[PDB]
DNA sequence: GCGGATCAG
DNA sequence: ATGGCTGATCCGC
């Protein structure tokens, strides 16, 4: 279907709903954000410009000192993980158009439902509108999870170090083993066919081995990305999917080349608003981001404009800090209305007990409950409170979210809090 | 420390 | 009729 035949047709089942409703809403909060930022962008002089320019270039120049090229580091994605799954242990779904989900929303869908414009995160009856023809088949979280580890048990050879990002996704630093594998027999990286096949000792070839045993061992795609440092690896590795790898060579020119005329959007980190925002200064390349960098110092924050400025002159991250230990853990649940504040609180302390046995799991505790609630307008608000003493039983849990539900019930009283969703936080662990 | 928001997969 | 979850972080206050 013709980019601007879906558009139209979600417009057409999406529009007058509550949640549309809420996204005109939030689009009007954005473009007042635009508008300040525009506002406070007329207000700058060519002497601040000029003063910011120097402060900019004379840090730009301390990263460009610092680049480093010399790791070799690769992104794995699984393709269509969550579809390709589910059309593996059913081959009736093979060669037509699916989605795994719900009628209430989708985590997936396999190349055929895409070119009909499903997507992740679509509500299902949506999807049903862009192609009634789809299949949804409801998610096997369990089988996704054991494919995970069998993939992860590859990805441990290569590098044992290795960081997932999820079950479909990771990182790994195959630079201590491209080393050691310059010197292997061709025995040590030779496979048979599920005949026997042996891979190179290239970058290229490495990333190639793990796809093929990956194709093996579970019959599923995945692709990969091959680059001196995380930013680069994560961006190629969505280049030639699916099924498919790309390699940015270690060398300053050709990271360059490719940067060049990379849209922003195409980063991780630089979603939808950031998007739109960049663009309303005429930014959409990252080479247009490095043009601007003394523009962007006065308008965004310090953290905000360091990371642009990464991403404009290509750098990233390249070595794998291994994954620290958590800093909160959380529940939440959707529902058709609730309205009777009996049940609001006897839900509240259900969302509290399941918290309370995910705490128990990793032995921990925390000081800071925080309560969520979305209004059936979809209106989300949060509330906190920190406490002294150490908190980790259903009981501590639910007795201070208990407090912070009634504030919200009794501030709108007479009225009811019509929810549609409510969570419940806990956070501030120990040093 | 809080609340609202963005982003990720 | 049906518009998800969990965790991390940032911005402004
Ligand atoms: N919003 C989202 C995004 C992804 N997911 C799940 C479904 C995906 O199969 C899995 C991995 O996401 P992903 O790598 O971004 N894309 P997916 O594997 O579906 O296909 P490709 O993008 O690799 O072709 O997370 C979800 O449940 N909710
Ligand atoms: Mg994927």
């Given at each position: 279907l013709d980019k601007e035949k879906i558009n139209k047709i979600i417009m057409e089942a999406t529009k007058g709903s509550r949640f549309y409703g809420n996204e005109l809403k939030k689009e009007k909060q954005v473009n007042q954000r635009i508008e300040n930022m525009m506002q406070q962008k007329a207000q700058i002089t060519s002497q601040q410009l000029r003063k910011a320019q120097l402060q900019v270039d004379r840090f730009a120049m301390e990263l460009e000192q610092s680049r480093n090229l010399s790791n070799t580091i690769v992104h794995i994605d699984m393709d269509a993980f969550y579809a390709a799954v589910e059309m593996r242990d059913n081959?009736?779904?093979?060669?037509k158009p699916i989605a795994v989900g719900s009628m209430s929303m989708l985590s997936t869908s396999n190349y055929h439902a895409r070119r009909f414009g499903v997507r992740a995160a679509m509500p299902g009856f949506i999807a049903k509108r862009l192609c009634p023809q789809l299949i949804i088949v409801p998610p096997n979280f369990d089988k996704y999870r054991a494919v995970s580890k069998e993939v992860k048990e590859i990805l441990a050879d290569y590098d044992p170090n290795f960081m997932a990002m999820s079950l479909d996704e990771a990182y790994l630093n195959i630079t201590k083993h491209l080393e050691e594998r310059?010197?292997?027999?061709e025995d040590k990286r030779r496979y048979f066919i599920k005949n026997s096949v042996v891979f190179g000792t290239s970058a290229q070839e490495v990333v190639k081995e793990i796809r093929f045993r990956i194709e093996q061992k579970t019959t599923l795609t995945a692709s990969a990305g091959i680059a001196p440092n995380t930013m680069l690896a994560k961006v190629c590795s969505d280049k030639?999917?699916?099924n498919g790898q790309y390699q940015i060579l270690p060398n300053r020119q050709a990271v360059m080349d490719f940067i060049?005329?990379?849209?922003?959007?195409?980063?991780?980190?630089?979603?939808k608003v950031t998007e739109k925002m960049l663009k309303a200064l005429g930014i959409i390349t990252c080479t247009e981001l490095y043009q601007q960098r003394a523009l962007l110092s006065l308008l965004f924050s310090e953290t905000s404009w360091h990371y642009f400025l990464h991403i404009s002159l290509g750098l990233g991250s390249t070595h794998l800090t291994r994954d620290g230990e958590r800093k909160s853990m959380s529940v939440e649940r959707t529902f058709s209305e609730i309205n009777k504040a009996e049940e609001q609180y006897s839900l509240c302390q259900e969302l509290c007990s399941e918290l309370a046995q995910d705490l128990q799991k990793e032995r921990l505790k925390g000081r800071t409950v925080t309560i969520k609630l979305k209004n059936v307008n979809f209106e989300v608000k949060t509330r906190a409170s920190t406490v002294s003493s150490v908190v980790s039983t259903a009981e501590e849990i639910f007795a201070i979210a208990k407090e912070l539900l009634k504030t919200e019930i009794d501030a709108d009283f007479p009225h009811?809090?019509?929810?549609r969703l409510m969570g419940v936080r806990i956070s501030s662990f120990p040093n």
């Amino acid at each position: 279907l013709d980019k601007e035949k879906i558009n139209k047709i979600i417009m057409e089942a999406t529009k007058g709903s509550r949640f549309y409703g809420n996204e005109l809403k939030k689009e009007k909060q954005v473009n007042q954000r635009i508008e300040n930022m525009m506002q406070q962008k007329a207000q700058i002089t060519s002497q601040q410009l000029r003063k910011a320019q120097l402060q900019v270039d004379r840090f730009a120049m301390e990263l460009e000192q610092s680049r480093n090229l010399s790791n070799t580091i690769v992104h794995i994605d699984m393709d269509a993980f969550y579809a390709a799954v589910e059309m593996r242990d059913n081959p009736e779904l093979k060669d037509k158009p699916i989605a795994v989900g719900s009628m209430s929303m989708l985590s997936t869908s396999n190349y055929h439902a895409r070119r009909f414009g499903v997507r992740a995160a679509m509500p299902g009856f949506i999807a049903k509108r862009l192609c009634p023809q789809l299949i949804i088949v409801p998610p096997n979280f369990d089988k996704y999870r054991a494919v995970s580890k069998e993939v992860k048990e590859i990805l441990a050879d290569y590098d044992p170090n290795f960081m997932a990002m999820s079950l479909d996704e990771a990182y790994l630093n195959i630079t201590k083993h491209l080393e050691e594998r310059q010197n292997w027999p061709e025995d040590k990286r030779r496979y048979f066919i599920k005949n026997s096949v042996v891979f190179g000792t290239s970058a290229q070839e490495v990333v190639k081995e793990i796809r093929f045993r990956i194709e093996q061992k579970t019959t599923l795609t995945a692709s990969a990305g091959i680059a001196p440092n995380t930013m680069l690896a994560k961006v190629c590795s969505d280049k030639n999917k699916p099924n498919g790898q790309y390699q940015i060579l270690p060398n300053r020119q050709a990271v360059m080349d490719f940067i060049k005329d990379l849209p922003i959007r195409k980063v991780s980190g630089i979603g939808k608003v950031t998007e739109k925002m960049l663009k309303a200064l005429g930014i959409i390349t990252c080479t247009e981001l490095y043009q601007q960098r003394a523009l962007l110092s006065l308008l965004f924050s310090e953290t905000s404009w360091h990371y642009f400025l990464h991403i404009s002159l290509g750098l990233g991250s390249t070595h794998l800090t291994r994954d620290g230990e958590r800093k909160s853990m959380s529940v939440e649940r959707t529902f058709s209305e609730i309205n009777k504040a009996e049940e609001q609180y006897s839900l509240c302390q259900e969302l509290c007990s399941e918290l309370a046995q995910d705490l128990q799991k990793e032995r921990l505790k925390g000081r800071t409950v925080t309560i969520k609630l979305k209004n059936v307008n979809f209106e989300v608000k949060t509330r906190a409170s920190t406490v002294s003493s150490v908190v980790s039983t259903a009981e501590e849990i639910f007795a201070i979210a208990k407090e912070l539900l009634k504030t919200e019930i009794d501030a709108d009283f007479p009225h009811p809090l019509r929810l549609r969703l409510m969570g419940v936080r806990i956070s501030s662990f120990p040093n």
